[PDB]
Design a protein around this ligand. Structure first.
Ligand code: C0Z
Ligand code: CA
Ligand code: MG
Lengths: 234, 52
């Protein structure tokens, strides 16, 4: 996350972190329930073997709430394509259930029609992760969050060098130096409604980080709610 | 602005228009309150709530 702020105690409890064999984070995820994590399908190539860590805010200290979970099954959307990042979504079923506590709670899944007319029409969403703090820098040791404005679909299409499919939406800033970045991929894009946070996106891709005339591109979770439901029912 | 277009139909969460009236509902882990509008968590650590 470029710009934004640190997630303070209890503020981003649905954040998950995919960790490789070296116990290093390479992607984010969103806690959906005690057994399931939502992530980007493209993250499932960044490491050969990975686990999921929850409750972490500082990768340098042990704050007592951290919990590592092994993955039982990987549910990658079969229509995901590396060519365009269309259908950039996956659900992970964990071997053991997550125990909710301070810094560990799920984000809500909304209903499609209501989310599209009421959540996605809000001014902003919130993105979070342990990703780079600058385009060329290293991964953040601290969990960060960033308020990102929803961007007009037309403007987004005009800004992009590549196709923005119906399974994508844009959020962020034209010129302001704030955006998600490398390592935030697969993490949460949530939208607040009356003090309740609903999952609305998955950090997907972008032409660099916080570039002028470019926005962050997110998987449109509302297009996959039925798919997620099926993935969680098995 | 009418029904669900008018302040989310006064619902805490989901709003549906059925037979030209507002019908409120809630995310899993919540139960619709007796006023048919508010959403009450059914157990600890309900989805979408920042912790403590
Ligand atoms: C040509 N096709 C393949 C399209 C679809 C997928 C994709 C990705 C990129 N890049 C270029 C580098 C960048 N990587 S990054 O690690 O800096 C990164 C990764 C994810 C992001 C996600 C958001 Cl929301 C914003 C910025 C992000 C930045 C990144 O994601 C460029 C073009 C295309
Ligand atoms: Ca820690
Ligand atoms: Mg920009």
């Amino acid at each position: 996350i470029v710009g934004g702020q640190e997630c303070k105690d209890g503020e981003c409890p649905w954040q998950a972190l995919l960790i490789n064999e070296e116990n290093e984070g390479f992607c984010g995820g969103t806690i959906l329930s005690e057994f399931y994590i939502l992530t980007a399908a493209h993250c499932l190539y960044q490491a050969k073997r990975f686990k999921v860590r929850v409750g972490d805010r500082n990768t340098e200290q042990e704050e007592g709430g951290e919990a590592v979970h092994e993955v039982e099954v990987v549910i990658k959307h079969n229509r995901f394509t590396k060519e365009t990042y269309d259908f950039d979504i996956a659900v992970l079923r964990l071997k053991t259930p997550i125990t909710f506590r301070m810094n560990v709670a799920p984000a809500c899944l909304p209903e499609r029609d209501w989310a599209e007319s009421t959540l996605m029409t809000q001014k902003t969403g919130i993105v979070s992760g342990f990703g780079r703090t600058h385009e060329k820098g290293r991964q953040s040791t601290r969990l960060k969050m960033l308020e990102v404005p929803y961007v007009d679909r037309n403007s987004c299409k005009l800004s992009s060098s590549f196709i923005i499919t119906q399974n994508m939406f844009c959020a962020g800033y034209d010129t302001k130096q704030e955006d998600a970045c490398q390592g935030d991929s697969g993490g949460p894009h949530v939208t607040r409604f009356k003090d309740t946070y609903f999952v609305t996106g998955i950090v997907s891709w972008g032409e660099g980080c916080a570039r002028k005339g470019k926005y962050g591109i997110y998987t449109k979770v509302t297009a996959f709610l039925k798919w997620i439901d099926r993935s969680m029912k098995t | 602005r009418k029904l669900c277009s008018l302040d989310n139909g006064d619902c805490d969460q989901f709003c549906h228009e059925e037979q030209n009236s507002v019908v409120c509902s809630c995310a899993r882990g919540y139960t619709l309150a007796d006023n048919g509008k508010a959403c009450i968590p059914t157990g600890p650590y309900p989805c979408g709530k920042q912790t403590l």
